[PDB]
Each structure stands twice: as C-alpha cells, then as structure tokens.
Design a protein around this ligand. Structure first.
Ligand code: K
Ligand code: K
Ligand code: MG
Ligand code: MG
Ligand code: MG
Ligand code: MG
Ligand code: MG
Length: 41
RNA sequence: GAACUCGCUGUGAAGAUGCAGUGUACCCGCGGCAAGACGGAAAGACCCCGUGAACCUUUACUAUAGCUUGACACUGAACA
C-alpha cells in the first residue's frame, strides 16, 4: 500500500516521501495516528 | 358356492356325505358329546423365492458431520 508520510516515521522516511508499506501497517497504525495518509491525489 | 348333507371297501390332484360297488336307512325335534366336515379365526411367523424392505454390525464400498495438518487471508513494527 502506497502512502505519503506526514510526520517523520522511523525506518521509513520523512514528510512527503512516497513509500510502499504493508496494508496492516498503514490501516492500523500510520493512518489512525496521523503519521501517513493514503496516496490518493 | 349351492345342498334332497349315511356306513364300508375301493377309486381318485394320491386321506370321499357327493365317484364305483355294496351295506344300512320311515318323516321331524329336544338334551347331551366332540371323532370327521383336511371345522371357524389370521392371503404361514417356519422354509424357500424377489436382482423386496427395514433396522443393526464391521479392518465391505463410497461419502460425510466432527476432530486434526499446513498454505493464503483478516495480519503489523525493529535485527535475528
Ligand atoms: K356308492
Ligand atoms: K366334532
Ligand atoms: Mg377312502
Ligand atoms: Mg342336537
Ligand atoms: Mg363340549
Ligand atoms: Mg382351518
Ligand atoms: Mg401367503
């Protein structure tokens, strides 16, 4: 799952970095805690 | 089924009131008895048959609930 990082996340990247994560990591952590957003445009 | 519904010895789907031969016997009740009418009752339960049934058994066959195995999914993060 492609997401855009918003907060600086460790072992991933920085603000605006396009990165592929496992869907569970995005769905259950990064998105609900406001660390990433889905790469919608 | 209908009867004007005797004995005997034979004959005969082979154990006869009903056939043959023969013997006996006037017509009709009532009380009794059960030897026979292969008496009545129940489409033999035994026995066999039907490519009949049911339920039961099991290391008969084929399945299958359940139980159990792993893969993928729900399921992610740091090195090992
Ligand atoms: K006679
Ligand atoms: K009798
Ligand atoms: Mg006789
Ligand atoms: Mg009498
Ligand atoms: Mg009597
Ligand atoms: Mg009888
Ligand atoms: Mg019969």
């Amino acid at each position: 799952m492609q997401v855009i990082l918003l907060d600086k996340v460790a072992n991933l990247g920085s603000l605006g970095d396009q990165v592929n994560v496992k869907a569970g990591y995005a769905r259950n952590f990064l998105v609900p805690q406001g660390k990433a957003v889905p790469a919608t445009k």
